[PDB]
Ligand binder design. Structure first.
Ligand SMILES: [Zn+2]
Ligand SMILES: [Zn+2]
Lengths: 488, 482
């Protein structure tokens, strides 16, 4: 008679990803199927990559898709806090218990030490693992080194022989040798935990009963199962979902198909269609969230890797567009781009470049086209040969992919940094941005246009221009990455 | 006495730029002297009347008296003014200044033939001028169709005192015997405006140069009646940059064309004022620095490129809010967009595909590519023919709706040796700039009459246009089509 409770636990380290929505949909349907609750927990334990902006992008993207949770950082809940950065005291308590009970230990190995051990191991054809150095430390030495304030971590003990049985709800028993595990770090030197500890503690304290996650987390499942044993906690039911696949059997990557949810919103896809498509890849047709929930059952999940096919997603999205009143269609188009907020940002940039209103559409059309018409001749540069032009586009694209705050000045800073580093003037690079972003050699202010267009469409158009001109080889990619990392 | 000016547009078509030019000067002259400017309709369709009101008001022109705003010296529609016109024509016939004519249209058409064969300007030969009082009483009792004509001198010269040109001499032997009352009991535009100007207290008659040749007949009617003549001024013609007369073949003349193309009314009104007298200024400013003497004796030039530059300055020299409001009214409103919506909803797989598909609804013209007009069962000469004939019949279409637009295109086809399905391949590129697009017939109704004709004409002129031998030959086809 126990109420079901599932969760999605994304890290706010970048754009909201389609994979996250996919897993969130399954955990949502399973909880609603069983009359339970669906929780959202922000795993911002990586305070060097987590941002408050990325947190809100997660909320907006999922809510836009139609996914809603009963408890979370933005709605509250009786089992919070739901941000792992607000639960520091909790993780220390349970990490200390493990050490007290002998199931974990303090490690003082400096980064210079761990690197040396890994080298000596790779030279002995051995599997790289923590050598257990600090596991056999006297209590006298441990007390001393901690009193001096020496940096340290907490590692868990793991078996060296035998096998762990992972009882997947769909695969059955999955045997994983313990010797593939290592003495995983639980508490980092900065007093923050790893997901191994945070997810076990938090899934337990929040009463999570079923955990559907992607199969990428299955290899490390034994360490979580073992942590539950150490605490004497009841383990939740586990199901590891196959990966999303590109139609060519490869893994879903930003190169082949964009993975950002916001990309499909800005491209003009309906949230009902994208959500509907994620469900059709999952289990066993056009349906709403409510209808997908009533017909949901984990057994109907194809044991094969679901395929993300933009062709089928576009056909489905057209079916949704067609199978609704013109009023509904109109309201969706307004929310998408035909609204005063978007149009008034464009207004001041066309007002000075038209002699009558009929010239606005050819000038501002690129604000609504998604991509732009690709004309390779528009990138013939006077000072830059074709190879140098591809280098500039690749370096700019990389820096803009890493840019977290999509704002004109930060956008300009990335481009100007790529140019100054290459001993180029910003005036030498902007002529390439115009055709990439707008499709024309001259247009409105391109830096303003990129901020208005947003990060997703700007990167998409830059990548297409790069691919139009041939792209970059593996050799060039390696050589240009060295340059990327030396740029602010 | 208070100055009183007017315009008397006929509600028989779309309002042309020439009408707004004349209206502006009449409005400015009246305001300068603290008088009234009157709009009179000498009717013809009640819809065409509202077009005139809407187009002139959109420009910023107003009138103190008229059929819509009323006034103390109406009615302001001829059709509402009773049998006042037959009364004055009868006085002229009784006082011997007019006479009754029984000539048949077949006979008046023959005299015109003999006169044009001599390179003469056609005139009424004066047949019925001296018919017996008995012969006329008989035919009238029998109910024979007849009209009333005014008598004009045959020798001498009429001195027309123009406020700008000075004295203009015109020979009476050029004037003809103008019809006063038509065979249907309605007055001619000539008699009605003379009668109505007198009854409405019009003091200054500012007209286009096209009416100068008839000034003697106006002067003589006032003479016959014994009425005080109004001050007269005939404005020089609007001309293209090549010194020719303004023509829809060269530059479009409908006010509504420039509205649908995205010009600001303050800019077109300013351009009409900056052409005549003496640079950007408003209407209230135009009235401030207005004076008739600043008009040049030579015709003003309607230069579209100069108009575009001026419109661009009006767009720039205003707040972004004012600019956005103007763009909303021009085309970015729910009425226009919801007309397009159902025609793109079934043709897109995502919203980012809408703008490439629907862009032609906003581009004024479209990108021209001659290669798009290559037809299987049609040659480069026949394509121009259908385009011309389609254009002509659509230029004559009064009510611009899909069911009547399709009728015109079908009539040109049925009359031709081809089926309707044979012509649409040419319409799609001309109207949308693409080989295929949304329902082109629904698109033309949405785009409007002005932009549809403009694009068809641009397409026709792209492919080469029509020669003189082709036009006169193809018009005979146009007139044989419903
Ligand atoms: Zn250690
Ligand atoms: Zn006669």
């Amino acid at each position: 008679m126990t109420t079901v409770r599932t969760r999605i636990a994304p890290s706010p380290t970048g754009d909201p990803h389609v994979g996250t929505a996919y897993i969130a949909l399954f955990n949502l349907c399973f909880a609603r199927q069983h009359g339970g609750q669906f929780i959202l927990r922000i795993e911002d334990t990586d305070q060097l990559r987590s941002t408050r902006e990325s947190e809100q992008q997660i909320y907006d993207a999922l809510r836009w898709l139609g996914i809603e949770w009963d408890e979370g950082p933005d709605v509250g809940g009786p089992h919070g806090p739901y941000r792992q950065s607000e639960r520091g005291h909790i993780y220390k308590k349970y990490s200390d218990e493990l050490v007290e009970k002998g199931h974990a230990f303090t490690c003082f190995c400096t980064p210079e030490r761990l690197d040396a051990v890994r080298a000596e191991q790779m030279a002995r054809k051995e599997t790289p693992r923590y050598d257990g150095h600090c596991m056999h430390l006297p209590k006298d030495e441990v007390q001393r080194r901690l009193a001096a304030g020496e940096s340290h971590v907490t590692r868990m003990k793991v078996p060296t022989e035998g096998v762990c049985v992972v009882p997947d709800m769909l695969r059955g028993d999955v045997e994983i040798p313990w010797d593939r595990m290592d003495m995983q770090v639980l508490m980092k030197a900065d007093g923050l935990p790893t997901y191994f500890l945070a997810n076990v503690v938090d899934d337990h304290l929040m009463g999570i009963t079923h955990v559907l996650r992607g199969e990428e987390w299955l290899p490390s499942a034994p360490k979580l199962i073992k942590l539950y044993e150490y605490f004497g906690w009841e383990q939740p039911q586990l199901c590891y979902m196959p990966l999303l696949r590109n139609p060519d059997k490869s893994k879903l990557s930003k190169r082949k198909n964009p993975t950002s949810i916001t990309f499909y919103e800005r491209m003009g896809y309906l949230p009902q269609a994208l959500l509907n498509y994620l469900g059709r890849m999952g289990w066993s047709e056009k349906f709403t969230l409510a209808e997908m929930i009533e017909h949901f059952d984990l057994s109907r999940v194809s044991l094969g890797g679901p395929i993300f096919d933009l062709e089928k997603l576009s056909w489905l999205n057209g079916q949704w567009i067609r199978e609704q009143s013109v009023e509904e269609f109109a309201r969706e188009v307004q929310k998408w781009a035909l609204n005063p907020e978007y149009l008034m940002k464009i207004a001041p940039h066309v007002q000075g470049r038209v002699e009558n209103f009929s010239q606005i559409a050819p000038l501002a059309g690129f604000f609504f086209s998604g991509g732009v018409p690709l004309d390779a001749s528009l990138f013939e540069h006077k000072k830059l040969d074709p190879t140098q032009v591809r280098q500039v586009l690749q370096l700019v694209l990389w820096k803009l992919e890493s840019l977290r705050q999509w704002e004109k000045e930060r956008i300009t800073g990335c481009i100007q940094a790529v140019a100054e580093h290459l001993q180029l003037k910003l005036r030498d690079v902007m002529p390439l941005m115009f055709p990439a972003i707008t499709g024309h050699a001259s247009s409105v202010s391109v830096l303003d246009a990129m901020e208005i267009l947003g990060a997703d469409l700007s990167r998409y158009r830059l990548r297409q221009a790069l691919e139009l001109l041939g792209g970059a080889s593996k050799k060039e990619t390696k050589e240009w990455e060295k340059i990327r990392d030396a740029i602010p």
